[PDB]
Design a protein around this nucleic acid. Sequence first.
RNA 1: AUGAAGAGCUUUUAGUGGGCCAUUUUUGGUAAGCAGAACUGGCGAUGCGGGAUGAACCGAACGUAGAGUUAAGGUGCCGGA
RNA 2: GGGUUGAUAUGAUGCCCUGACGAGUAGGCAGGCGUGGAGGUCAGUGACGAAGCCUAGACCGUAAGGUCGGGUCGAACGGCC
Lengths: 185, 159, 127, 171, 51, 58, 222
Amino acid sequence: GIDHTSKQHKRSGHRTAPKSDNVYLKLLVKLYTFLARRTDAPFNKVVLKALFLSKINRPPVSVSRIARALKQEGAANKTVVVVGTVTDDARIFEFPKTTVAALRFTAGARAKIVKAGGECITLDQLAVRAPKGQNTLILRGPRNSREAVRHFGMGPHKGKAPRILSTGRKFERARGRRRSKGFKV
Amino acid sequence: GKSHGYRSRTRYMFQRDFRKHGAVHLSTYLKVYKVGDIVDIKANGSIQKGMPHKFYQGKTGVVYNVTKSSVGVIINKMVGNRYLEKRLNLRVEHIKHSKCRQEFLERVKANAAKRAEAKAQGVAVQLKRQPAQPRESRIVSTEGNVPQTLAPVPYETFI
Amino acid sequence: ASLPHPKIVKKHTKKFKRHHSDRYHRVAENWRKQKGIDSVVRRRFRGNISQPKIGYGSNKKTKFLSPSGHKTFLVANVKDLETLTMHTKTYAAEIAHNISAKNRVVILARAKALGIKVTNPKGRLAL
Amino acid sequence: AHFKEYQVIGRRLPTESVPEPKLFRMRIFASNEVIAKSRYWYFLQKLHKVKKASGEIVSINQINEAHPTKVKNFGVWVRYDSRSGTHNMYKEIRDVSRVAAVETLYQDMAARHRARFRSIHILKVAEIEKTADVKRQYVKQFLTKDLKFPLPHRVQKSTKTFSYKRPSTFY
Amino acid sequence: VLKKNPLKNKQVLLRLNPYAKVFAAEKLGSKKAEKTGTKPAAVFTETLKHD
Amino acid sequence: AKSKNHTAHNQTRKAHRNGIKKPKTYKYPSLKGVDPKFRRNHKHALHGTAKALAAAKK
Amino acid sequence: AEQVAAERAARKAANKEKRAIILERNAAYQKEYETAERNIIQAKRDAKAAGSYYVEAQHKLVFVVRIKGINKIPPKPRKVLQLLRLTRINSGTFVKVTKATLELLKLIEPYVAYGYPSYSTIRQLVYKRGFGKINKQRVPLSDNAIIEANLGKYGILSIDDLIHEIITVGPHFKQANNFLWPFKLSNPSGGWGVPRKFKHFIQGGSFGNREEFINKLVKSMN
RNA sequence: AUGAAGAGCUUUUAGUGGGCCAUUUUUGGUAAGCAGAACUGGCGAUGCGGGAUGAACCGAACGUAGAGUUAAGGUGCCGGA
RNA sequence: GGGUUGAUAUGAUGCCCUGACGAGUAGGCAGGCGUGGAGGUCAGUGACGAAGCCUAGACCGUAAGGUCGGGUCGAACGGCC
Ligand SMILES: [Mg+2]
Ligand SMILES: [Mg+2]
Ligand SMILES: [Mg+2]
Ligand SMILES: [Mg+2]
Ligand SMILES: [Mg+2]
Ligand SMILES: [Mg+2]
Ligand SMILES: [Mg+2]
Ligand SMILES: [Mg+2]
Ligand SMILES: [Mg+2]
Ligand SMILES: [Mg+2]
Ligand SMILES: [Mg+2]
Ligand SMILES: [Mg+2]
Ligand SMILES: [Mg+2]
Ligand SMILES: [Mg+2]
Ligand SMILES: [Mg+2]
Ligand SMILES: [Mg+2]
Ligand SMILES: [Mg+2]
Ligand SMILES: [Mg+2]
Ligand SMILES: [Mg+2]
Ligand SMILES: [Mg+2]
């Protein structure tokens, strides 16, 4: 027999073949795994992996985030790539003439980007415009901004948002939260 | 009843020494501790203030803070299936520099010297230490060293 | 007529029978795993029955093949039969059990015309 | 196993305080060189401050018998540990080589004293070069003029399991 | 698809090692040694034969 | 009906299944428990240093 | 793009040069081995003539074989066997001899048989049971191109240069021996020689340092 | 130095919270197949060859098959040698 | 771990190559089998005999189970998503 050092027959732990049954997403995957296989470009592999992701690992990306990303140096004439959805943001009042490639656009985001003179692009048109990731800029959205993450790691002296339905006075603001009432955490 | 106090089972550990009782020499207080210095912990029993718990006897840590009379040491402590970092505020009588770091830094500057010396001619310093290798061939002479034959000795009582 | 295939190997031609299907009538022969804490069969003591496991699986080249070398395909009519027109060397027709005698004649005639093998060309024949 | 005699020479490891140490030597009866070198250190640990880590072996050499066909009479001085205590022995063995004598000695001790190889020490093996210095009658018996004796009750071993005549023990 | 063992199958032996052809040509597995007229000292022999 | 009070049997096996990992060490560790008289100056010194580098490569 | 003649011929020509290089390197290695043997022989002779003793160089290389199954091993020996890559009974590995490894071996002594291997058994092992670690896979060597691709960095082009880096313990012994998958040996064809394995080779068993008797055992196991 | 079989990170949740045996260290007890601790390894949760027979000992851990070689244990017959 | 959209033919969750591994109670997860009914489809089977029952008769599947033949029977019943 074998004295095994590792766990046998363990899955990689990484998603392949997105479990969404959406055929258009499957077609994007069929294209981008081919490109990742034959282009020698890391961009194709990044995008292919990102297309597998779940909704919470595909957070929305604001047009204001895109504007920040283009306010970098040498990034004004670049192609922004969001493997996910692009949302609008009324907190900006100017937007540049960039082109943005994404799975989905909200109506407001599309309208803003087009009204600014830009164009809204799909990841398949990105494939013909930039098969190896020419002049691209991949943006991911914020993951820990979620509500569930407030409660991850709940315990004494962590400061991590107890799970609670009704908030206010007399809902978890007593013994265990102030020295006057026993102890503070 | 049971007994698990702070100084439980410290009888021989916080004992002072044989013929080294009394006050402590002044080098303990004239030594200098900066942040990042590696220090071993050995409790003096005559200074009851600023003592470590018995767990940290013979433990080596890194300084993280310096105060009037004390020094802040970080230690790694095994608690179940993981290590937790522990912050002690220890008076310096219970504290001495570890000589391992000094012996490592001497080797550091020696290796730098060797590298600068042998870069002037490119002769492949090979600065890494190596384990004790097997011993090489050699020749043993019998000149004045003729073999002396031995034999097992019989059994005697010797009482 | 069959396509050339290797020697067909099975690795267990004996039916896996439930422990004590020979001892109690209430216990049917359909395989059930013994889930007992003290089961000799679950623990695999020497001299007990064998349990089905994936190592007994058949070669993927010879799986689902009858000894003739054909894969069986059930048919209920000539339209279902005609799917095997260009697959005679791989698939053999089996007329379903609920087909009438007068339609079996038609299916067998068309299968003889198209060169399709039929595994049961004797059901519901009178003479 | 079948024994061999090895000259093993060893030497405390040299230093700056004292190079050229004193080169101790031993004769070892053993089935191979690994066991010979093990026993060399076993005994040298009992005699001197040295062990395999602080010493070395300069030469191991097989000693063959100079006259493997002269019938010698040997005396062997033995230390052996019993179950109660430790004892000394002198045994006389009539044989053709030192290794054969030592084999026979280990077997005789295993038989008559239930002593094992780990329990037996050989102090020395010495050829008795003058008859009448022998002192054991079981050896002195075969040192008689024009000796001759028969072998009564011969048993012939049969290749078959059925014999068609009664056998004979004549000789 | 199949591990052929050198030390048999001379073809694979020669695929791995081209020196195997001239090794056999010169019979280097049966090389003879130059004779030497060295004799040990008396101290070696007398220490060996010592009791 | 007495019972077994205590044993550490199997606990090392259990710990070493997924165990004795060092926690980890980061660059720029916490300044927690450090002297406030030192922290209060370090704030101002870092402010001044940032200002100086800004005006330097301005 | 006919390309079936020109580039094929160029590939064949490029292979002819590599095989010439391998041939001359192997001739050199033979000349080296034979001289290294003959010279220590003559040195022993000359020391005997001068009345001295020739203390041969302690060995730089051992071959270790796992002799015990996987059940009922304490943790320190279990870890040391995992570190020597001896994860099954009758798995074998070459080990460089140093103060750091002799203690490892003293720890795992009741579970392994080890000793000093010869060129003949090293060569037979690498040629019959010769497997490389290429992208975490056990590839039979079977050709010098694998070795040239995975060890050509370290001057190694042939199975023979590999054997040389092994036996003449070189700068790249670590990388060569790690490239070599653990040798999967059978049980000895003639048996173990003893009735009882788990005593020391000295006490009549099989484990421990059988300094030069390991070649016989390994050849029986290979 | 050796090895790394991928490294690190998070979320959630099941069962469990009666234990027992062997080597060694050891407490009470005359002692116990007793009671209680320490380290490891095992049974529990594990079939296989051996120990006639046995939860734990020896050997060795299991997909289905073939050939070869062996471990422990054995080779008068029962019984392979 | 990798290879393979190229037009013409069938299945990219496909086909292929390579290496390793395979014990298991409590327990977890995955892929499948079978039952009553619902939507869709096979312009499916059927008084020239549905369903059910019997059958040391046959075939497929590791198995769950499925299929066929014969007998009995008499009015309905199945495959696939
Ligand atoms: Mg296995
Ligand atoms: Mg003390
Ligand atoms: Mg039944
Ligand atoms: Mg049970
Ligand atoms: Mg193969
Ligand atoms: Mg309890
Ligand atoms: Mg035989
Ligand atoms: Mg045996
Ligand atoms: Mg729990
Ligand atoms: Mg619980
Ligand atoms: Mg239980
Ligand atoms: Mg077991
Ligand atoms: Mg044992
Ligand atoms: Mg067999
Ligand atoms: Mg017999
Ligand atoms: Mg794959
Ligand atoms: Mg279960
Ligand atoms: Mg009917
Ligand atoms: Mg019946
Ligand atoms: Mg009716």
